[PDB]
Each structure stands twice: as C-alpha cells, then as structure tokens.
From Swiss-Prot:
Subunit structure of this chain's protein: The dynein complex consists of at least two heavy chains and a number of intermediate and light chains. Interacts with DYN3.
Full-protein residues shown: 3533 to 3882 of 4092
Species in which this protein is naturally found: Saccharomyces cerevisiae (strain ATCC 204508 / S288c)
Name of the encoding gene: DYN1
Domain of life: Eukaryota
Free-text domain note: Dynein heavy chains probably consist of an N-terminal stem (which binds cargo and interacts with other dynein components), and the head or motor domain. The motor contains six tandemly-linked AAA domains in the head, which form a ring. A stalk-like structure (formed by two of the coiled coil domains) protrudes between AAA 4 and AAA 5 and terminates in a microtubule-binding site. A seventh domain may also contribute to this ring; it is not clear whether the N-terminus or the C-terminus forms this extra domain.
Residue runs in coiled coils: 1-58
Function text: Cytoplasmic dynein acts as a motor for the intracellular retrograde motility of vesicles and organelles along microtubules. Dynein has ATPase activity; the force-producing power stroke is thought to occur on release of ADP. Required to maintain uniform nuclear distribution in hyphae. May play an important role in the proper orientation of the mitotic spindle into the budding daughter cell yeast. Probably required for normal progression of the cell cycle.
Identification of the protein by name: Dynein heavy chain, cytoplasmic
Cellular location(s): Cytoplasm, Cytoskeleton
Family stated for the protein in its record: Belongs to the dynein heavy chain family.
Length: 314
C-alpha cells in the first residue's frame, strides 16, 4: 500500500533514501577533504538542513498506518477464512502468494472505504470460481457480514445474525430490522423460499461475477486445473470456449501407457507451437500425473492447457 497507493509516501521514502545517501557521501567527502588538508599541511550545511527537514517523517507514516489498520485486520480475516477453506476440503488450498498477487491486482486495475470495497470485490471475484455453489454462497455471505458489520451499526449486525439463525433452523425470533428490502426479505422467509432469500442476499451485496469465459480470460499462467462432480462434465464447455476463442483444442483422455505417451507427445507439440490441451479424467493415471506433469510444471507464448479432475476423487 505504501509503495503503490499514495504518491506522497513513496516520494518521501525516496527522498529519505536519497538524503541518507547524500549524508553518507558528504561524510565521505568531508573525510577525504580533511585527509587532503592534513597531507598538504556548504554541502555539510545542505545535508544538515535536509536531515532536519527529514527528521519529521515517521509520525506521518505512523498516523497513516494507524488510519489504515482496519484494512489490515480485514485482510487477516480474509486470509484466515480462505485458509480455513483449505481445511474443510483438501482441494481448496489458498496460500500467501496468491492473496498477495490479488491484493496487488486490486491496485493494478472515502479513500479507505473505496480501497476496502475494491479489496473485497477483487478477492471475491477471483476466489469464487475455485469453489462449489454452496461454499460460494457461504463465502459470499461471510464477506457480506465482514463488510456490513464494520461499515454499519450493531443493531444491523444483530438483525443479520438472528435472521441467519432463523434461516439455519437454530434460533427463532422477530428481528429488529432497520425499505422495500425488508418487504422482499419477509415475503421470502414467510413463503419459505430459502434459495430466493440467498439469491436476494447475493444480488443485494455483490453486483459482479465471473463465468467460465471471464475467469479463463483474466488469467496469466500457462497451467490450469479444473474440477467437477462426476455427474457434470466440462469437456464440451471447453470445446465451446475454444470455438468462441478460436483456439485449437484437442481432448486427451488418460488411461493406458500408449495414451500416456500420446499425451506426452501432444503436450510437447503444444509447448512447441502453442495451442490448448485438455487431459480428461486425470484421476486415471494418478502416479503418472504426479510424476510427469509435476516435473513439467516444476515458457512459450500463446500456450494454455487444462486438467480435468473430480471433487469426489483421490
């Protein structure tokens, strides 16, 4: 944030570094001049003035840090939740580097309120696609609570908790709700339209989302992984995506050793001349994947590939 959000802080940091370098150079020049004078027997004032001017820079940075601590607490909360999601199921690993990349991409694309809104929107829009529908709803409502409980009052927080409780069949009671939003919410819960209530929450807070085309469009790395339940198949979805993107897709089912050699030859060819690669059901040759593809992953242009696996798999 100090590097790429405010120009004043970066300019003052550069000025302080330059002043330290100038003070060191002035001390070296003074020592050399003293040695020359001993052998033959305004710069210092400017350095002193610069040091006196730069002596009061830390209080401003401390005040800026104190004014931007709620965003840090919110980032810690976000990373704690996304790490908790890696414990609920083992396919949802979220690490520090990815979150640092998304927080940087917040700035790459009420200043505190707007920067926090941008952080929440980018984090949700980037981390939603890696989740199934129920966990997507869960995480969306947790960010809704984490935003509306720290921008708004306490009675709103209690009302949200008690209506989540009556949604969860745990605690029942008349809330102290405090517009036409309340009419729709009451007309949903009294009609027992739970999916409509969750849809109304999601449409009320979040206004943007990524489809498959959007998430594959705003991507940079050349390695991809795709997962689904065994009753749903994304092979023809990738076929339609490649037809819309005018990219050459060749489906490669796994299986026997000849299929593995064919897959190796085709991914070598696609690393050579570009293209798109789909490995259907990478659950088949698990050890072969864990050796060959992991060794390949650990820089041609216009080269993308995909891996299709299953949530209810190894």
């Amino acid at each position: 944030t100090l590097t790429e959000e405010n120009a004043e802080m970066q300019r003052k940091r550069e000025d302080l570094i330059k002043l330290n370098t100038e003070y060191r150079l002035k001390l070296k020049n003074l020592e050399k001049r003293l040695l020359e004078e001993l052998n033959n027997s305004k710069e210092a004032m400017n350095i002193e003035k610069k040091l006196s001017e730069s002596e009061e820079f830390f209080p401003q940075f401390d005040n800026l840090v104190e004014e931007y601590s709620i965003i840090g607490k919110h980032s810690v909360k976000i990373f704690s939740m996304l790490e908790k999601f890696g414990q609920f199921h083992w396919f949802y690993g979220i690490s520090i580097g990815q979150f640092l990349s998304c927080f940087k991409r917040v700035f790459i694309k009420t200043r505190v309120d707007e920067i926090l809104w941008l952080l929440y929107q980018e984090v949700y829009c980037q981390f939603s696609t890696a989740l199934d529908k129920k966990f997507k709803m869960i995480m969306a409502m947790t960010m809704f609570c984490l935003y509306k409980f720290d921008i708004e009052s306490e009675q709103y927080k209690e009302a949200v908790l008690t209506m989540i409780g009556v949604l969860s069949e745990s605690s029942d009671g008349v809330p102290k709700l405090t517009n036409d939003d309340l009419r729709y919410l009451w007309d949903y819960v009294t009609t027992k339209s739970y999916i409509s209530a969750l849809n109304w929450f999601k449409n009320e807070f979040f206004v943007d989302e990524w489809n498959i085309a959007d998430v594959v469009a705003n991507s940079e790395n050349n390695y991809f992984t795709m997962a689904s339940e065994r009753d749903v198949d994304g092979t023809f979805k990738l076929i339609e995506l490649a037809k819309a993107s005018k990219e050459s897709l060749k489906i490669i089912p796994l299986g026997s050793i000849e299929n593995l050699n064919y897959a190796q030859e085709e991914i070598s060819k696609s690393k050579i001349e570009g293209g798109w690669i789909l490995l259907q059901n990478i659950q088949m040759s698990l050890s072969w994947v864990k050796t060959y593809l992991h060794k390949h992953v650990e820089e041609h242009e216009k080269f993308k590939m995909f891996m299709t696996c299953h949530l209810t798999g190894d």
